[PDB]
Amino acid sequence: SAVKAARYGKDNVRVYKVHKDEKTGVQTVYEMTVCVLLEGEIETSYTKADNSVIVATDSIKNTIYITAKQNPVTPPELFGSILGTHFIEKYNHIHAAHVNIVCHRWTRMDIDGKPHPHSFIRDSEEKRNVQVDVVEGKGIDIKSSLSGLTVLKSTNSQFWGFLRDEYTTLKETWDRILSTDVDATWQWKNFSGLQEVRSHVPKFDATWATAREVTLKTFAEDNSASVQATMYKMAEQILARQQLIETVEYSLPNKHYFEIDLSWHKGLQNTGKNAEVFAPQSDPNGLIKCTVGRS
Amino acid sequence: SAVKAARYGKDNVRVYKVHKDEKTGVQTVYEMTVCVLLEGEIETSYTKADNSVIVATDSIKNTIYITAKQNPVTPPELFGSILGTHFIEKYNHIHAAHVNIVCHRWTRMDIDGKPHPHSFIRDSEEKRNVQVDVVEGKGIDIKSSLSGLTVLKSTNSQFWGFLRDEYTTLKETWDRILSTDVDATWQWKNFSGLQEVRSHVPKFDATWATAREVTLKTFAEDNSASVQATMYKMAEQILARQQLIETVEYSLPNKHYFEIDLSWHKGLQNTGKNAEVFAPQSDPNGLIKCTVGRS
Amino acid sequence: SAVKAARYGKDNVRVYKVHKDEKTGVQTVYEMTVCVLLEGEIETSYTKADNSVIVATDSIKNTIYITAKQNPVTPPELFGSILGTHFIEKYNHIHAAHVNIVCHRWTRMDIDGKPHPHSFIRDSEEKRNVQVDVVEGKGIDIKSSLSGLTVLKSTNSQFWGFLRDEYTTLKETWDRILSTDVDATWQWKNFSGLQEVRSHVPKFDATWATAREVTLKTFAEDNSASVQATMYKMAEQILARQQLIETVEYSLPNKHYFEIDLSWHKGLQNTGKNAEVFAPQSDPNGLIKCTVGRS
Amino acid sequence: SAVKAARYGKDNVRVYKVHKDEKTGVQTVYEMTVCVLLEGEIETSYTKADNSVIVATDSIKNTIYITAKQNPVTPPELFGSILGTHFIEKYNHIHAAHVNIVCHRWTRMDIDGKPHPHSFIRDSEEKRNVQVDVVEGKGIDIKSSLSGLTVLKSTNSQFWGFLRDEYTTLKETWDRILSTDVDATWQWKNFSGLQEVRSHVPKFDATWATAREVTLKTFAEDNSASVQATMYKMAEQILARQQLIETVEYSLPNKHYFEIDLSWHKGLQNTGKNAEVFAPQSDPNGLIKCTVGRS
Ligand SMILES: CC(C)(C)/[N+]([O-])=C/c1cc[n+]([O-])cc1
Ligand SMILES: CC(C)(C)/[N+]([O-])=C/c1cc[n+]([O-])cc1
Ligand SMILES: CC(C)(C)/[N+]([O-])=C/c1cc[n+]([O-])cc1
Ligand SMILES: CC(C)(C)/[N+]([O-])=C/c1cc[n+]([O-])cc1
Ligand SMILES: O=c1[nH]c(=O)c2nc[nH]c2[nH]1
Ligand SMILES: O=c1[nH]c(=O)c2nc[nH]c2[nH]1
Ligand SMILES: O=c1[nH]c(=O)c2nc[nH]c2[nH]1
Ligand SMILES: O=c1[nH]c(=O)c2nc[nH]c2[nH]1
Ligand code: NA
Ligand code: NA
Ligand code: NA
Ligand code: NA
């Protein structure tokens, strides 16, 4: 037998950073969870009990904190590129570094109509994420995403015209609830290295903002024929607004809200045009995925 | 042996309701999770296999949906009072109904600067809750709360002057991070019944809003001597602004953010005035509780 | 305003302990999560920013570890009594200590039919818990429990003869699945102090074992008329086997498994005597509670 | 723009099945969670609002239940192969079916030393899983796994001889705790279709049993030089015992248990040979991965 693939490192590394403006007194906070897994000439740690090739996972943890102290942590695409580049440059025998970052929201509070200099709120579990793969000889591959963006529209969603056979019970509908948890990922052109990533830094926050704005406006304004049709419109608009992304991927659950027939009780009418009270269903759920690229 | 206490019912009942304005086209949504547990002359279901005294939990579930169809679901204090009153009035042998409601956020989206008529976002897992105990012969006891309001301030928190003995290692500090998940509960005066609850309906949303505003402004503006001192100021202000509440309770974790000494690495300075990068700690956590009433 | 109630301390303190027999080489492990909250003359920490009365929560954490080093951690009733007694004896102004302990399973592995000296498996998330309230001048109040014991029987559960009215849709049944997560708590006679707790130490593990054995045998062998009827039989047997407990409480969800009518598909028969495939329901769920004492 | 990849279906489908022996009275239960995602000529559902190509996710759900009624649900490799084959044979335009199954434990209870005919316990959240990819023209690709197998050994784990530089603080150790959650996956040779899967049916349960037995015996008996070294020994033994698997993959967290220095308190000795009480760490955690194949 032989090792065909291997990677190891430190997961679930929580990191906070503060920036303090001492002339204005304004503070800004950043919080993330980081994972770094390394690849390289490490097979003998597995086959021969040779730990000399292991950069200890504790040391990887230390390196995350040191890198955050000495470098910007925003945008996360940049921080992950800096961090992954470090491992392949510092260690001759390490040839790839896989950096995953989850960014947590800390939104400045408004108090009596004025932004507060040092107080923040977690407005939602929506995350901004990156996956940064730094591969020696191959450059830096970045996937950026937003996840956990939970939305609902109460009308202007439809689902009719689907295949019907002996397995089908679902009724067609011209007016339903649509609710989902948005997971949207944009895949950047390969970067040759850290210099090229730095050259595009303003594009990372701009493109996250565009993706979020397109997602919300299209969800709200599309009189949706299906999750499939609406998600494609989102993806195509994001591609049209950033030439440096190659693909946009969505993964969307269809979090079902079922009508409740109450007509067995005093003739109460709660279906169709009379539908007011619904039963949100925890499981099962539809799951719809698409990756859109340029022709 | 004998039954000393018993209650039973249906938990984890998810409920959605929509309101549609057909003149303006504006829709508004409400979503909750409901639990109803009943008490009364039910002991023989336990001791003698006598199911005649059991209102089936499935029937309790049906009743929740019917009640939501026929009545307002907001404010939740009102809905829970309506629902609990129903069981003690409908069933002679049922003498108490315990109704817990968790309200989930669906905040109207703003699209290009204008509120959208039918699209919503889950801005945060913060909940608005009620516990409504309807007890025949004793009235209606309501506890209202906000929970899951997660906040952080980056300075203007201190903790010094605590007891020091042979168990103490913690250093005093004049500048630390303070972060918590706010659980705040206000206990209303006993209401004699549903009519009295209805008479105070505008006070429920007003008091929730006051509690939230006081919590956030006091957290943001208090140069905090301890979690204890800051939470008391919140509670006293809420009591001063609503005569119909008797007590305010807070339960606050102290979600610790630890400094990280990096001076073992190239003399890097990351403590005290130089502290920039911190390690958020998942566990353990301080837990601080207070119930404040009027003198 | 004034403080009506207050308690504070450290929650979510994870603790492991090992015992090593150096003559036999046999090691035994214990793992728990501990919470300690203190009460006493602490109100001025809230009202006057007086931290002198605060035993820091960090110091409470240290004390948990020190107590585990110097004392047995099993049975948990004993450890919690030792720990809570410490705070009210050490600190004049602390008058109650509330200790909650969750014990995690580490069951010795059997390897080729022989118990292994130092390897363990988490067989299940079932917990053994205690709540120990040490109150100066009032003694020690102990509640012991098992929780997270998840069971299912595929027949010999019935539910018929319940109340039927205009809210009722549930069909009677003479053969259903019954599945639950057992939460069972036994409340000990008040103990005067730590000496009396020590005098009864063998009874704690014995009574936990009896409660577990009675729960499982009664669940398995009762042709159940309802959750209510079966849980009462468990409670009465536990009371009959330990004179030093005053009450037994059960809290049992009814985790529903719904029949699936497939007769719309090729006449397939999957209900009643033909029921083979079921849909487990995540929510809602029945919730049935009882506290049983002696007459 | 154009669709580059797409799949859709139903996730989180809970399924129970019972087998009843009416001659012996012995019942046996099976419970799973299923996901089915389909691929094929579905792009126009995304780009042109053409729902004619969509097999509704509700219909996929129905099909899961029907398939479980008409076919064995064990071993899960077989059930998933049957289910995925159905979609590519039934629907001309569907060309792949991706079936994921999580099997939940229901272990028969022993009551007074005898196996009970119809009562079961969830002994642990350990899962047995399959991923079955049925691809028209390409056969059936099966990955089998066990996950959530949580273990701890209290000695006979070491970690020394790792790389040391200016990022390293970790001390070498010759005696530590090792605890992990085992995720082990075995990748079968490609099968040409359902007939070939059926021909190997006894091998699926046999190989799961071998993987579990090898994992536990090797964990318990290896005086471990690292997680890396121990996991490789497991993988090589599993490959040696089943010629029809091509690779074995492990993913193992190193769930750290930290020593607690108490010597600041009365000189208490709790490190090194005196280490008795430890602090389990929830995060961060090492994460070690390997894929082993044959040379
Ligand atoms: C995944 C883990 C448990 C390491 N985590 O990131 C936890 C966490 C992150 C952020 N906030 O606010 C709370 C907890
Ligand atoms: C407690 C349970 C599982 C019943 N629940 O309420 C779930 C739930 C409620 C609201 N949202 O948005 C998601 C899930
Ligand atoms: C409640 C917290 C998060 C502190 N906890 O006890 C976690 C925990 C305990 C035991 N095991 O095996 C895993 C995690
Ligand atoms: C993933 C979901 C929520 C669908 N699930 O499988 C839940 C579940 C499965 C098995 N048991 O025992 C409890 C819950
Ligand atoms: O938008 C939708 N897309 C689908 O594929 C689907 N199937 C059932 N319900 C559905 N909804
Ligand atoms: O605000 C605080 N209150 C306390 O009781 C405490 N103890 C440690 N750290 C603390 N912080
Ligand atoms: O055992 C049971 N007890 C009940 O109260 C109940 N109601 C519905 N289903 C039920 N099952
Ligand atoms: O077994 C181990 N493998 C590692 O790579 C590691 N690094 C720190 N601690 C470790 N343990
Ligand atoms: Na390198
Ligand atoms: Na009544
Ligand atoms: Na005292
Ligand atoms: Na096909």
* CB of A105 shorter than 6 A to ligand 1: no
Environment class of A1 (CB within 10 Å of its CB; exposed 0-12, middle 13-18, buried 19+): middle
What is the CB-side half-sphere exposure of residue A163 using CA atoms within 13 A? 18
From A33, A44, A57, A74, the catalytic residue: A57
Cross-chain Cβ contact D116/C220 below 8 Å: yes
Q: Which amino acid is at A266?
A: K
The verdict on whether D215 is a catalytic residue reads: no
Give the residue carrying structure tokens 């042709």: C223
Q: Which residues, including other chains, have CB under 8 Å from residue C295's CB and lie 6 or more apart?
A: B1, B2
Ramachandran angles phi, psi of A84, nearest 5°: -70, -40
| Separation of alpha carbons B28 and B19, rounded Å | 5
- The residue of chain B with its CA nearest to that of D283 is B282
Please choose from D11, D13, D14, D17 the residue to mutate so as to test ligand 4's pocket, defined by most ligand atoms within 8 A of CB: D14
Q: Which token pair is A35?
A: 């994972």
Q: Which amino acid is at D272?
A: G
Q: Which amino acid is at D191?
A: F
Q: Which amino acid is at B177?
A: I
Beta bridge partners of residue B178, listed in sequence order: B153
Range of the domain at A113: 1-295
- Residue A231 near residue A258 (C-beta atoms within 8 A): no
D238's enclosing H/E stretch is helix D227-241
Q: Which amino acid is at A177?
A: I
**Which one-letter DSSP state was computed for residue B191?**
B
Cis previous bond, B280, omega within 30: no
Cα–Cα distances (Å) from A131 to A62, B95, D273, in that order, read 20, 58, 42
Q: Tell me the shortest Cα–Cα distance from A157 to chain D, in angstroms.
A: 12
Beta bridge partners of residue D249, listed in sequence order: D185, D291
Environment class of C222 (CB within 10 Å of its CB; exposed 0-12, middle 13-18, buried 19+): middle
- Residue A177 near residue A153 (C-beta atoms within 8 A): yes
Cα–Cα distances (Å) from A100 to A65, A80, A88, A202, B202, in that order, read 15, 7, 16, 20, 48
Cα angle B37-B41-B42, degrees, rounded to a multiple of 5: 60
Rg (CA), chain C: 24
What is the CB-side half-sphere exposure of residue A142 using CA atoms within 13 A? 33
Cα angle D142-D147-D151, degrees, rounded to a multiple of 5: 145
Q: Give the total residue count for chain B.
A: 295
* CB of A14 shorter than 6 A to ligand 1: yes
What CATH number has the domain bearing residue A255?
3.10.270.10
Give the residue carrying structure tokens 């079921």: C278
- Residue A144 near residue A186 (C-beta atoms within 8 A): yes
Determined by: X-ray
- The residue of chain B with its CA nearest to that of C49 is B229
Q: Where are the alpha helices (DSSP H) in chain B?
A: 43-47, 57-70, 76-90, 194-199, 201-221, 227-241
- Residue A263 near residue A277 (C-beta atoms within 8 A): no
Three-state DSSP at B232 gives helix
Q: Give the total residue count for chain A.
A: 295
Give the residue carrying structure tokens 């919140």: B234
**Neighbouring C-beta atoms of residue D223, cutoff 10 Å:** 11
Three-state DSSP at D208 gives helix
Beta bridge partners of residue D30, listed in sequence order: D17
Resolution (A): 1.0
- The residue of chain B with its CA nearest to that of C226 is B49
Please state the three-class secondary structure of chain C as a single string. Answer: CEEEEEEEEEEEEEEEEEEECCCCCCEEEEEEEEEEEEEECCHHHHHCCCHHHCECHHHHHHHHHHHHHHCCCCCHHHHHHHHHHHHHHHCCCEEEEEEEEEEECCEEEEECCEEEEEEEECCCCCEEEEEEEEECCCEEEEEEEEEEEEEEECCCECECCCECCCCCCCCCECCCCEEEEEEEEEEECCECCHHHHHHCHHHHHHHHHHHHHHHHHHHHHCCECCHHHHHHHHHHHHHHHCCCEEEEEEEEEECCEEECCCCCCCCCCCCHHHCCEEEECCCCEEEEEEEEECC
Rg (CA), chain D: 24
Number of domains in chain B: 1
Q: Which token pair is D294?
A: 């044959």
**Which one-letter DSSP state was computed for residue D155?**
S
Q: Which token pair is B27?
A: 């829709």
Closest partner CB to D2 (pick from A45, A66, A295) = A295
Q: Which token pair is C140?
A: 């020690």
C-alpha dihedral, D161 to D163 to D164 to D165, nearest 10°: 170
Q: Which residues, including other chains, have CB under 8 Å from residue B294's CB and lie 6 or more apart?
A: B239, B246, C1, C2
Cross-chain Cβ contact B119/A151 below 8 Å: yes
For residue C127, which ligand has an atom nearest its CA?
Answer: 3
D194's enclosing H/E stretch is helix D194-199
B260 φψ region: left (φ > 0), alpha (ψ -120 to 50), beta (else) = beta
Distance C168 CA to ligand 7 centre (A): 12
B151's enclosing H/E stretch is strand B139-153
Tell me the pairing of strands D27-40 and D114-121.
unpaired
**Which one-letter DSSP state was computed for residue B272?**
G
B6 φψ region: left (φ > 0), alpha (ψ -120 to 50), beta (else) = beta
| Separation of alpha carbons D39 and D44, rounded Å | 13
| Separation of alpha carbons D169 and D162, rounded Å | 11
| Separation of alpha carbons D282 and D280, rounded Å | 7
Beta bridge partners of residue A277, listed in sequence order: B17
Cis previous bond, B75, omega within 30: yes
Rounded to an integer, what is the distance from CA C231 to the centroid of its chain?
Answer: 15
Closest partner CB to A292 (pick from D4, D168, D225) = D4
DSSP result, chain A: -EEEEEEEEEEEEEEEEEEE-TTT--EEEEEEEEEEEEEES-HHHHHS--GGG-B-HHHHHHHHHHHHHHS---SHHHHHHHHHHHHHHH-TTEEEEEEEEEEEP-EEEEETTEEEEEEEE---S-EEEEEEEEETTTEEEEEEEEEEEEEEESSSB-B-S-B-STT--PPPBSS--EEEEEEEEEEEPPBSSHHHHHHTHHHHHHHHHHHHHHHHHHHHH--BS-HHHHHHHHHHHHHHH-TTEEEEEEEEEE--EEE---TTTTT---SGGG--EEEE--S-EEEEEEEEE--
From D33, D57, D74, D247, the catalytic residue: D57
Nearest to B127 by CA among B66, B44, B84, B185: B185
| Separation of alpha carbons A48 and D225, rounded Å | 10
Closest partner CB to A124 (pick from B65, B122, B270) = B122
